[PDB]
């Protein structure tokens, strides 16, 4: 079949044998890497669904029930908090976890006090009105960041497994067969050269012995 265009020599034969051995053991290496990443991918796909369910049934129940207005608080403003725009907070820090040998770009909660805004103590309503946004919404955004950590863990891992499986297929279906064909061709050509030299030597020996002896 398809083979590398190289000239048959014993050095090239040994080089191709070494390349084939390296290809086989690298194929096994990438196979193991793919299986590990696939197990972790199963786990991440389960936990991402679980996190999505929990966020879906925590966001509306607690975070979206803000009591800063109107009847539950001393003010009836639906966008009073937006008047206090300032430096962002409740932020995430993308961590570099050793997931399965590769390093992901997952995230972790690293909130900061920001401008220390609030839905009360100046927003008309009292402290009890800001309890929802102050605490339940903070927990909701923390959960959202934790879920985004499983979103980017899933995307990166899916990409990595796709690449690794493509490379395993390339090794076992394109590179290894090509190297084996090259080895077979080199072996056949070297056997042909050996036969030629052997029979030329035999002809010389027979001529000498049976004509000049």
């Amino acid at each position: 079949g398809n083979r590398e265009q190289v000239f048959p020599t014993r050095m090239t034969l040994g080089l191709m044998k070494t390349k084939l051995k390296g290809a086989n053991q690298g194929y096994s290496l990438l196979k193991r890497k793919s299986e590990a990443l696939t197990k972790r991918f199963r786990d991440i796909t389960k936990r991402i669904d679980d996190a999505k369910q929990k966020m879906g049934r925590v966001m509306q129940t607690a975070a979206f029930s803000l009591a800063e207005v109107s009847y539950a608080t001393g003010e009836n403003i639906g966008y009073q908090v937006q008047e206090s725009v300032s430096t962002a907070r409740f932020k995430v820090r993308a961590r570099q976890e050793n997931v399965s040998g590769v390093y992901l770009s997952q995230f972790e909660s690293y909130i900061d006090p920001e401008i220390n805004d609030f839905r009360l103590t100046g927003l008309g309503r009292g402290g009890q009105q800001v309890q929802r946004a102050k605490e339940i919404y903070s927990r909701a955004v923390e959960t959202l960041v934790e879920l985004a950590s499983l979103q980017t863990a899933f995307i990166i891992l899916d990409e990595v497994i796709k690449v690794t499986n493509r490379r395993v297929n390339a090794i076992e279906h394109v590179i290894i067969p090509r190297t084996e064909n090259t080895i077979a061709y080199i072996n056949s050509e070297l056997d042909e050269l050996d036969r030629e030299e052997f029979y030329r030597l035999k002809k010389v020996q027979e001529k000498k012995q049976n004509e000049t002896a």
Partner: peptide
């Protein structure tokens, strides 16, 4: 003729 073969005979 029994001549000495070159490459590939």
């Amino acid at each position: 003729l029994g001549e000495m073969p070159a490459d590939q005979g």
